Design a protein around this ligand. Structure first.
Ligand SMILES: [Mn+2]
Ligand SMILES: [Mn+2]
Lengths: 114, 87, 385, 297, 198, 206
RNA sequence: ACGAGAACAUGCGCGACAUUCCGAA
């Protein structure tokens, strides 16, 4: 699915209405910082501290959407905002790692199509 | 081979900004205090010394050279200037 | 049916090879060897100094003479034993003429020679190609000189070719109306003359030593890339010689110097056996996983995939060897995530945009990703300081 | 006599050498296993009378899931390269093969259906000289790694006490390991001894032809009547004596030529435990007794 | 009568272990041909324990009778039969989670003394979390030398824990730690309840 | 009797520590825990290079094996025939758990993306660049082993390790270094001869 | 009395040299 959304919003190169890795570096730095927290803990379920921090990730997602319009279009089309909801709903490490793999595949295809 | 260590204090006279609000100043993550990167200092002195990679041979040995076929180690190692505890 | 019965009688002879007396005398050993030759590992035969059997000591003595001379004189005095209480030695034109003058019933063989004046020589068509003998400095180390490279992995390559269904070609290939002793004998001579004589011209200029060509099979040791390149040249020339109608499969191995000689031939023989499976017109390259077609290896693996990668990486300051290794790691696994990581790796790889799309397309489809892996591996070996 | 099937599942790669350390064979003849049993028996302070006089074992043969492989009979086949390259034939297909009923395609499929392991060549170094101002010696050890469901098996004929002794010896041989680098991690296995049901059916049949199952050799008297119309393969059984007692320095055994497994004879011969030592402190035994599997050609 | 002692346990990797030799890899580690899992050869364990025990003792009769000998006159069968340490099933499942590769590529360089230029290198190493099931058989040829030999085995294993296994472990690699799951006498009447390693 | 002197402690990163590695310039991380690491080759190379310069460099040194005999003895030699074992073995210094829990408070990321740039002398335009650095609050559990081949030469060698550690404390461990990165301070938790009877009580490297 | 038996794929090696988050208000 990650390859599809990048394909659909790839325009001639303008991606996600002008999204670059510099626009996403604030969000992804938080995402991989959260990734190392989940990676280290050997728990089948997300930690309570991680859950509150992921809620702050949701807040930062909206903050970056308001700041950079390109990031806003990137989030809505991807549903990465909605994916941060379901991982908190399931509250499992395995679902979250699938979400991080989804975001990593997202920026990977985003760079591939640029 | 000898090492001579210059420890001192750089007291800032005006509003100092090294922005890594349009640009927040760079901060050491551990203490969240402002920091003067050692590369900011070293680059500034090197540029001013050159004015006063192809530079004068005196400058090249002082701050380092990476010329192909002749590499000179930087005789100067400017380190990050952290926020003073006393200040 | 006549030829099938002759070979059938031959196979029956091969089963019961020995008789009562010969078998008993085999098990009638008086003294254990307690000393063996380094090469032949034979203890029954008398071993001299240098720990070499009498036969292999003669074999080594034949070497350093096979390269220089072209006359093999069977004579009462020689280096290696031969039947009828004779021995085989390799001498020059003057040395061979001496030997035949001294004692009669002495045969002299000339290797790949054009017809000459009246003499008792017998023309032997033998493939004696040896790139090392061309340069005196490399002549000292025959095959180990191909390990010496300025750039590229030092490994040697071993090529073991074998024509597919040659026996079926003689029995069933010739139709009934065209089968005869003369028509068959012509086919034997054309196939023999290709291997014995034409192979030397095909492998010209390549760092390759021809251990054997002889009728149906082939054995070459040389530079790993020269062996692969001349395997494709030889396959193309074999298609021209045979005008289709006959395909050969080959195993190609990648073995360093000091690799066991028996293991070099055995493991490549296993590869040729793998290429002999199926429609038999295949080449087994390096590992048993890379059993490609001849057109597939020549065109899809090398020209279509390896050459674009080599040209792209040469244009940059460094010849890859770090994107190539990271590409291989991401191509070895079947995970969906590794595809995305490969996409990111290609994007940051700083080569042309249409090539990254091609490499990504190649990794997608099975039987096309293995071609991409072999293309990367060939390129990686091509650049090893 | 009673026939017990011994299945050897190997934990680690095994080095079965023909003539070189670099060689990586997938099987060992009966002479190799029997010498392993004699070495085990002398270690465990057991008696050698049962092994030397009553035990009739066969070559270690490949086996994988739902199949037991027997050696290719050296019978005349009434595409011939398919049988030439064929080595092992499953037991369920063994009765068919003797009668015929096997095309070149079927034999080629049978050979590829042998999922017995994968050979390789590990390269090691000898840093003994490195300490003494020298250089490392890179030597190669060829080893065979069996697949998870694969391994080697062999059948044993003997009395109750002979089989019972072999149950003890096979249990001790699990940890000595069979092979050539067993003190360097090559040859560990676990063996289960079970009464053979399918093999007892195959050994119960009585055809006109007799098929060897072990590397055997007839004595002088028996070779007179057995070699007629025989199709066999003489294998040069060589090697060094493995013993601390035989001699001060390691010496080779006398060369012994024995028929390969699968050789077909119209006259059965009982082999012998031949002696291949030369004036050593003890007699080196090379097993050449015959394990006969009769068949109808 | 003759006894055999089966020491079985774990070789936990403490730092990336590289014992040199699927595709093209820069200085690859030795792997199982079938499963393509990194392994620790028994000859590598045997050689490193023999090397460390030879240094500790000082060939010596203690080393020769423990790791085997073939010298003229004194041919000693090797009592230690150190099997290949294969990648454990537990560490395979543990590495499958986190989708962590069993081996990692370590990037280094060599800054020349003459020119001060860095020439990069890559050696593949088994990742730190790896664990290998080691299976050692000690043949009790002497019931009087077993206690002294098992003292030597413990000394050689203790040295090996403070040293590195195969590779450039002077620069970090190869560090390992042994764990003994059990020491049970599989063959013979000898008892190993008193016997222990580490 | 073989004896080995184990030196275990911490490496406190006074400034951001950037030892490069595989995947804007990521630091080398231990793959098992995804925590930043200090490879033992970085430590051994920096100590050897600094100590060899301090002792003196033979002019036109084409190889590392042409170092001083004190350097070759301590860090190993590879000359044909005259192969020297390395008395000092330096292991990878992993991100300590003590510092990891300390970074868990304040929710530090174990790393910082330091934004540098280059101002070309001609164009006077800035070319940005991002390099990752282990945060200055971090500390790495470093573990070293010293082989004892000559008891008589231990005091001289541990004086050389004292000089090497002292030199490394002033310089950097990896990365820009002269631009501020890589400053470290060695903390010696304990010294103990784990195997061997050697007396390491009267031994110190800092 | 296992083509055996002994044998560390091992030794040396910094992911490093130059690089102002800067010009404009
Ligand atoms: Mn053919
Ligand atoms: Mn042929």
């Amino acid at each position: 699915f990650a390859r599809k959304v990048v394909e659909e919003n790839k325009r001639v190169i303008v991606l996600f209405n002008g999204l670059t890795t510099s626009k996403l570096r604030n969000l992804l730095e938080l995402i991989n910082h959260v990734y190392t927290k989940v990676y280290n803990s050997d728990d089948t379920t997300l930690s309570e501290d991680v859950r509150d921090e992921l809620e702050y990730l949701k807040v930062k997602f909206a903050y970056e959407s308001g700041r950079e319009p390109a990031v806003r279009t990137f989030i809505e089309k991807t549903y990465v905002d909605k994916l941060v909801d379901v991982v908190l709903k399931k509250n499992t490490k395995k679902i979250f790692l699938d979400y991080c793999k989804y975001f990593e595949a997202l920026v990977a295809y985003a760079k591939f199509y640029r | 081979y000898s090492k001579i260590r210059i420890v001192g204090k750089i007291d800032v006279l005006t509003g100092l900004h090294i922005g890594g609000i349009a640009s927040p100043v760079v901060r050491d993550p551990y203490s969240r205090l402002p920091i003067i990167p050692g590369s900011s200092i070293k680059g500034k002195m090197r540029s001013l010394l050159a004015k006063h990679n192809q530079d004068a041979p005196e400058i090249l040995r002082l701050f380092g050279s990476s010329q192909k076929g002749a590499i000179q180690s930087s005789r100067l190692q400017i380190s990050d200037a952290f926020f003073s505890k006393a200040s | 049916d006549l030829w099938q019965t002759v070979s059938r009688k031959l196979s029956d002879k091969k089963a019961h090879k020995y008789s009562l007396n010969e078998i008993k005398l085999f098990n009638s050993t008086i003294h254990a060897g307690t000393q063996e030759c380094k090469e032949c590992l034979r203890s029954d035969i008398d071993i001299s100094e240098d720990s070499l059997c009498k036969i292999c000591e003669g074999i080594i003595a034949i070497s350093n003479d096979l390269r220089d001379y072209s006359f093999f004189v069977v004579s009462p005095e020689g280096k290696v034993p031969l039947p009828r209480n004779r021995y085989l030695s390799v001498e020059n034109q003057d040395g061979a003429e001496r030997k035949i003058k001294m004692n009669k019933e002495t045969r002299i063989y000339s290797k790949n020679q054009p017809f000459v004046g009246k003499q008792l020589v017998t023309n032997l068509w033998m493939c004696d190609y040896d790139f090392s003998t061309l340069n005196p400095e490399t002549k000292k180390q025959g095959i180990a000189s191909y390990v010496n490279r300025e750039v590229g992995i030092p490994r040697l390559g071993v090529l073991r070719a074998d024509i597919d269904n040659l026996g079926t070609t003689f029995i069933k290939g010739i139709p009934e109306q065209y089968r005869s002793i003369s028509r068959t004998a012509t086919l034997s001579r054309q196939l023999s003359m290709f291997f014995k004589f034409e192979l030397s011209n095909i492998l010209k200029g390549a760092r390759i030593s021809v251990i054997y060509s002889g009728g149906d099979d082939l054995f070459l040791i040389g530079a790993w890339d020269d062996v692969i390149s001349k395997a494709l040249v030889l396959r193309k020339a074999f298609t021209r010689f045979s005008a289709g109608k006959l395909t050969f499969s080959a195993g190609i191995g990648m073995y360093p110097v000091k690799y066991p000689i028996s293991k070099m031939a055995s493991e490549t023989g296993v590869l040729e056996d793998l290429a002999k499976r199926g429609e038999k017109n295949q080449v087994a390259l390096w590992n048993d996983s890379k059993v490609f077609g001849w057109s597939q290896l020549e065109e899809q693996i090398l020209k279509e995939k390896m050459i674009p990668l080599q040209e792209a990486l040469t244009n940059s300051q460094e010849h890859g060897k770090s994107f190539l290794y990271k590409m291989l790691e991401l191509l070895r696994n079947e995970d969906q995530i590794n595809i995305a990581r490969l996409a990111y790796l290609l994007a940051r790889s700083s080569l042309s945009e249409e090539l990254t799309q091609s490499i990504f397309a190649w990794s997608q489809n099975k039987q096309q990703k293995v071609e991409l892996i072999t293309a990367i591996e060939y390129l990686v070996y091509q650049i090893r300081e | 006599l009673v026939v017990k099937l011994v299945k050897l599942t190997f934990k680690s790669p095994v080095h079965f050498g023909m003539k070189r350390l670099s060689d990586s064979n997938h099987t060992i003849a009966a002479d190799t296993l029997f010498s392993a049993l004699i070495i085990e028996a002398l270690q465990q302070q057991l008696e050698l009378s049962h092994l030397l006089n009553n035990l009739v074992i066969t070559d270690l043969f490949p086996y994988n899931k739902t199949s037991y492989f027997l050696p290719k009979p050296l019978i005349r086949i009434e595409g011939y390269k398919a049988f030439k390259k064929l080595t092992y034939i499953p037991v369920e297909n063994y009765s068919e093969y003797l009668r015929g009923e096997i095309d070149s395609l079927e034999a080629s499929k049978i050979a590829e259906s042998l999922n017995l392991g994968k050979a390789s060549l590990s390269t090691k170094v000898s840093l003994q000289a490195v300490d003494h101002n020298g250089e490392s010696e890179p030597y190669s050890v060829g080893n065979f790694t069996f697949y998870p469901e694969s391994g080697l098996y062999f059948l044993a004929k003997g009395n109750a006490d002979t089989i019972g002794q072999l149950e003890i010896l096979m249990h001790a041989l699990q940890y000595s390991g069979i092979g050539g680098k067993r003190s360097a991690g090559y040859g560990q296995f676990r063996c289960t001894i079970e009464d053979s049901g399918k093999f007892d059916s195959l050994l119960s049949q009585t055809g006109n032809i007799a098929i060897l199952l072990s590397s055997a050799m007839a004595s002088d008297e028996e070779l007179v009547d057995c070699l007629e119309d025989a199709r066999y393969l003489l294998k040069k059984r060589t090697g060094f004596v493995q013993s601390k007692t035989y001699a001060d320095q390691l010496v080779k055994k006398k060369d012994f030529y024995a028929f390969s497994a699968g050789s077909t004879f119209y006259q059965k011969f009982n082999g012998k435990i031949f002696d291949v030592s030369d004036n050593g402190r003890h007699s080196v035994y090379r097993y050449a007794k015959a394990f006969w599997l009769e068949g109808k050609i | 009568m003759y006894s055999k002692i089966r020491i079985v346990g774990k070789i936990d990797v403490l730092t990336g272990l590289h014992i040199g030799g699927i595709g093209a890899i820069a200085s690859p580690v030795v792997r199982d041909p079938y499963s393509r899992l990194p392994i620790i050869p028994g000859s590598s364990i045997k050689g490193k324990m023999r090397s460390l025990l030879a240094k500790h003792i000082g060939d010596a009769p203690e080393i020769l009778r423990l790791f085997g000998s073939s010298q003229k006159g004194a041919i000693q069968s090797s009592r230690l039969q150190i099997s290949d340490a294969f990648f454990s099933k537990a560490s395979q499942e543990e590495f499958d989670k986190k989708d962590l590769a069993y081996t990692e590529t370590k990037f280094e360089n060599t800054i020349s003394r003459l020119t001060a230029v860095a020439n990069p290198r890559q050696i593949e190493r088994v990742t730190r979390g790896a664990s290998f099931d080691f299976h050692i058989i000690y043949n009790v040829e002497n019931i009087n030398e077993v206690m002294a030999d098992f003292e030597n085995i413990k000394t050689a294993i203790h040295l090996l824990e403070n040293d590195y296994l195969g590779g450039g472990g002077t620069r970090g690699n190869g560090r390992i730690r042994f764990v003994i799951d059990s020491i049970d006498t599989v063959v013979g009447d000898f008892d190993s309840s008193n016997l222990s390693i580490k």
